[PDB]
Amino acid sequence: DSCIQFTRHASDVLLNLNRLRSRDILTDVVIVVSREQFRAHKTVLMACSGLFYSIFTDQLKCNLSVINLDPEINPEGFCILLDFMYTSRLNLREGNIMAVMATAMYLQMEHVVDTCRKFIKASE
Amino acid sequence: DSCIQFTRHASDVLLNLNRLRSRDILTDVVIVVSREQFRAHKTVLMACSGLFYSIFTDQLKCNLSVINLDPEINPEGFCILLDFMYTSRLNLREGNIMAVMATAMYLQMEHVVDTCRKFIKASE
């Protein structure tokens, strides 16, 4: 086509989706990670995670308002990944890298798994 | 903070949101523009438009499944802007620029209004 493209559009959209999440506007699901609860938008979770994409395209699970993750999932690791979904920024630290990588593998977020593998390899 | 950033994350999210729109997955509103109907995600519309942001934060309109636009709104102009919301690409042509700019003013999409004003000014 002969379209023009606004360079910052995708980033501006994601910024506003994070603002709606922070104000709890039109969030339609709560992700339960052991004792912790995280409110989010199903569409954003699906757009970021192979696991959520599979869950919310399922003809019964698409209608659930609560999703319980595997008890081995670390709440902080999930929190870091949810923040990444809504901002493109990943808070990867020596103290959390193992939990972040395991959570990213479970959530099927391949680019996160990739940077975790590389950061771990450099420390070996 | 000490976060790392994935450059293509925002674009990849928007691409997946457009794929969900194309397959009509978790769309929660229909925008009626005279004889034409457009299915979308309220969160994406709010993230792109000052008008939709105002509509869907309203305590009664937030729950509507159908929104009727002003009868002066051109369906093609709306279609072009909805495609832009979900892709960052604007199909701006001599034959549609007036309808696109008027629709962008109504929808409160200031960056679109700006490029339309500039493209019109260059032709004068």
């Binding site: 379209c3 023009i4 493209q5 606004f6 360079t7 | 690409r89 604007l90 960056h111 490029t115």
Partner: peptide, 4 residues
């Protein structure tokens, strides 16, 4: 705005 750019030519993509």
């Amino acid at each position: 705005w750019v030519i993509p």
